């Protein structure tokens, strides 16, 4: 005998009509005639409230409502849904240029998930997205977003996941201190400046993806504070040396990629990568790394993938590599190494093409 709040229902009708799905205007009660993509929950007063709303062919067993490419748009009537907790738009393309609507800020405290993935949105990110105070997941992946990252993102105190990948964002990465932030994905943009220092103060971070940007400067020696960090991808930036003298506070780190920072131009101290108990993947290719292959890399226990191709490495391959039997990929090609190769028939015949040593004129046997 429960029924849906009437204004929330009429707002649902209008949202659906705006998205191209005028049929929803006919359901007598959208909350009890709940479709896949809408979720309701009742208060203590036996009245239904709309809580989640999803659009786009994310699929599953079932699919969400899709948006007519001729008619659809994001309706301001979303502001009438006072209790909305989650909003999904996935590949829901309108007719023409459309910006992220500013009125999304007007449903502030309730919203915890805002996903606007691959919708063709243009222009700058609205500043008033900062009103969504309790946001825990924000996903703006692969749009066409002008300009800078809004500073009002400082207000997302509870944010768990920030994904702005695949846009045209410019300016330096603003330095928020988000204590619960777990994933930070800003890869494939046009971001510049140094690594923000405040980055090393978000200790819940397990993933930092800054790859394919224009970030400059050195890796701050304070990344050691990120004791929960699993993946650190800084590939294809304009980073420079040196490595931090010690990387020991980075346990849980499984993958570190700096490929394509073509002016990194430092050496790898023996002391640098000691202590990384869970380091599985280390990619340092095409960064103008200088000096000799530190033998300490031999003693990394979990290491499966070691990429050092395309640098100015010189000298002997540490003979201790003879004793490494867990490497599945090891690339040393296109340097100027010079000694005799110290790998056993044992692991040479296991690794085969996944061991690259060519284009080192020095190498023997």
């Amino acid at each position: 005998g429960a029924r849906t709040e009437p204004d929330e229902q009429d707002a649902v009708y209008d949202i659906m009509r705006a998205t191209g799905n005028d049929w929803a205007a006919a359901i007598p009660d959208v909350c009890r005639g709940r479709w896949h993509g809408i979720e309701c929950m009742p208060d203590q007063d036996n009245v239904y409230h709309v809580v989640s709303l999803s659009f786009g062919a994310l699929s599953d067993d079932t699919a969400f409502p899709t948006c007519d490419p001729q008619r659809s748009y994001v309706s301001e009537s979303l502001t009438r849904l006072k209790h909305l907790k989650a909003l999904f738009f996935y590949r829901c393309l309108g007719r023409a240029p459309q910006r992220i609507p500013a009125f999304l800020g007007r449903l502030g405290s309730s919203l915890q998930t805002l996903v606007l993935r691959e919708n063709g949105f243009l222009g700058p990110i609205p500043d008033e997205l900062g009103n969504l105070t309790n946001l825990k997941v924000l996903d703006l992946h692969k749009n066409h977003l002008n300009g800078s990252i809004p500073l009002s993102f400082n207000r997302f105190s509870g944010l768990r996941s920030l994904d702005l990948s695949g846009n045209r964002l410019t300016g330096s990465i603003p330095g928020f201190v988000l204590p619960a932030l777990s994933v930070l994905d800003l890869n494939q943009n046009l971001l510049t400046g140094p690594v923000p220092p405040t980055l090393t103060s978000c200790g819940s971070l397990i993933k930092i993806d800054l790859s394919r940007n224009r970030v400059t400067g050195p890796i701050p020696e304070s990344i050691n504070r990120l004791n929960q960090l699993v993946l650190l991808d800084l590939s294809y930036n304009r980073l420079s040396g040196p490595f931090p003298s010690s990387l020991q506070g980075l346990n849980s780190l499984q993958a570190l990629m700096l490929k394509g920072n073509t002016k990194f131009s430092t050496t790898i101290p023996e002391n640098a990568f000691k202590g990384l108990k869970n380091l599985m993947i280390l990619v340092l290719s095409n960064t103008n790394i200088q000096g000799s292959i530190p033998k300490s890399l031999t003693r990394l226990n979990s290491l499966r993938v070691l990429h050092l191709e395309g640098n100015n490495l010189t000298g002997e391959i540490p003979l201790e590599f003879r004793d490494v039997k867990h490497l599945s990929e090891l690339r040393l090609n296109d340097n100027s190494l010079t000694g005799p190769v110290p790998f056993e028939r044992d692991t040479v015949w296991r690794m085969r093409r996944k061991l690259r040593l060519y284009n080192n004129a020095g190498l023997c046997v």
């Binding site: 994933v183 499984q254 993947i281």
Partner: protein, 544 residues
């Protein structure tokens, strides 16, 4: 240029005897019409390669990385060896990659993370070793990740669970250690979570009720401890597969509200307490597997309210009381296994309304009374294990009119009378164990009509008369156990025509004579004939 690459891919196979005769760069000009290759009709470049189920038997050449415009690769079922070549990583347009059912070894290559268009990574059933790398979280469009059937190692880093577009997480059958995480419920778009057959310790996360998109939750056979969290009741799963673990505590009653459930498997754990009667209103489940625990109390009669129940296994528990007659409401019940319990009383007559009933196993209880006649209505019955109980009365004549019986165990009871001759016309019967009863009369000669029979046990009875000589007609009979009866007469010479008779035990009877030339006399036990007074052989206890 592209035919160069296709020719290298061909040359890296092996068993291509009369297989890719199409593939000929000079005697076959159009590479866009060779077997299993598909081009787009504008640039005539290879976009899709499907060589499924041909057993080409070689390796995956790195030249597959030279078909830059590939959108789909299917090399399943070809006995392929070697490692997954790194060059697949420069198939930037790749959307679908299926290397399942092969013999590929090594790690999941790093270059796989370069495939920003990939939606299906199917590496099922290979010899891949190494960790599930975090790099797979860098595939923004990946919907299907099937890595089942390998030897992958390490833990399931919680980084993996932060993904909104993933649909299918298949990790079944690897050697993954560590724990589930609460971040598991961040898989907001997942419908299939399968991690069965690994070695994951820890408990079920208490926030698992946030995982409301799941359609199939499978963490079975994994060494997971703790109890079943209450929030499990918020799942919308149709399959809840928790079996084969180390779960303790009672069965949360809230599971009775999960009306979308279709398969509930809590078996082979260390659960305790009663079967919650609320399970009755699970009106859409067809499989209820609660066997192998330490459950207590009755078979709740509300189990008969499960209209669509088809497979009910409550064996190896500690249930008591009677078999509820309301079980006869389950018109679609197919298999009923109540074995190894402490049940009591008669087999209910009403259970003859389970017309489609196909396997019936009540072995190892304390049931009483006679086999009701209405069991003749169980036409589709196939497996009938009433063994180790306290039944009495005579084996019904009507028992022989269940034409599809292939396994019949009445052993370990207190059946009386003589064996019905209709037992002889169970055409498809394979196993017939009537031992350990009070059966009297003769061993029926109609047992010769048991075309398919392979095992006949009627030991420890009061059978009299002679060993039927028609048993020689039984061409599949490999075990003939007649000991501890009162059979007299000579061992038939025709038993030598049992082409497959390997085990024979006729000891402790009143048999006389000598043993005929058996073609498998040496495979018998030593005491095969002891305890027959007037039987003359080369053993102690014979007059010879």
């Amino acid at each position: 240029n592209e035919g160069k690459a296709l020719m290298a891919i061909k040359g890296s196979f092996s068993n291509l005897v009369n297989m890719l005769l199409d593939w000929d760069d000079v005697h076959n000009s159009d590479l866009c019409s060779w077997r299993g290759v598909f081009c787009d009709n504008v640039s005539y470049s290879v976009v899709s390669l499907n060589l499924s189920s041909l057993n080409l038997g070689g390796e995956i050449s790195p030249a597959i990385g030279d078909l830059r415009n590939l959108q789909s690769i299917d090399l399943q079922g070809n006995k392929l060896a070697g490692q997954i070549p790194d060059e697949i990583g420069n198939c930037a347009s790749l959307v679908y990659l299926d290397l399942s059912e092969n013999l590929l070894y090594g790690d999941i290559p790093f270059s796989i993370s370069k495939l920003k268009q990939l939606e299906t990574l199917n590496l099922k059933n290979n010899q891949l070793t190494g960790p599930v790398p975090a790099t797979l979280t860098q595939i923004p469009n990946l919907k299907r990740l099937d890595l089942a059937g390998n030897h992958l190692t390490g833990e399931i880093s919680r980084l993996l669970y932060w993904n909104e577009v993933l649909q299918y997480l298949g990790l079944r059958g690897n050697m993954l250690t560590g724990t589930l995480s609460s971040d598991m419920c961040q898989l907001t778009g997942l419908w299939y979570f399968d991690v069965r057959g690994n070695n994951l310790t820890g408990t079920i996360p208490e926030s698992i009720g946030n995982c409301t998109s799941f359609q199939i939750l499978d963490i079975s056979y994994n060494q997971i401890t703790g109890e079943i969290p209450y929030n499990i009741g918020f799942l919308q799963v149709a399959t809840l597969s928790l079996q084969g673990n180390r779960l303790t505590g009672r069965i949360p009653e809230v599971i009775g509200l999960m009306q979308a459930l279709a398969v509930l498997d809590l078996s082979d754990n260390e659960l305790v307490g009663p079967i919650p009667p609320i399970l009755g209103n699970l009106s859409f489940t067809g499989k209820l597997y609660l066997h192998g625990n330490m459950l207590t109390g009755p078979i709740p009669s509300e189990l008969g309210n499960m209209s669509r129940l088809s497979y009910l296994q409550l064996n190896d528990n500690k249930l008591v009381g009677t078999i509820p007659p309301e079980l006869g409401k389950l018109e679609q019940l197919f298999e009923l296994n109540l074995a190894n319990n402490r049940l009591v009383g008669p087999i209910p007559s009403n259970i003859s309304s389970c017309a489609a009933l196909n396997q019936f196993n009540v072995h190892g209880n304390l049931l009483s009374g006679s086999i009701p006649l209405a069991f003749r209505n169980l036409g589709s019955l196939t497996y009938l294990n009433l063994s180790s109980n306290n039944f009495k009365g005579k084996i019904p004549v009507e028992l022989g009119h269940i034409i599809n019986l292939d396994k019949l165990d009445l052993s370990g009871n207190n059946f009386s009378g003589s064996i019905p001759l209709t037992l002889g016309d169970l055409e498809h019967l394979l196993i017939l164990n009537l031992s350990r009863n009070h059966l009297s009369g003769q061993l029926p000669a109609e047992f010769g009509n048991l075309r398919s029979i392979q095992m006949i046990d009627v030991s420890f009875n009061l059978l009299s008369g002679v060993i039927p000589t028609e048993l020689g007609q039984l061409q599949n009979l490999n075990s003939l156990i007649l000991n501890n009866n009162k059979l007299h007469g000579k061992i038939p010479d025709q038993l030598t025509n049992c082409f497959t008779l390997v085990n024979l035990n006729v000891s402790f009877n009143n048999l006389s004579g000598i043993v005929p030339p058996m073609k498998n006399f040496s495979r018998f036990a030593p005491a095969s004939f002891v305890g027959n007074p007037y039987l003359c052989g080369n053993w102690v206890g014979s007059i010879c």
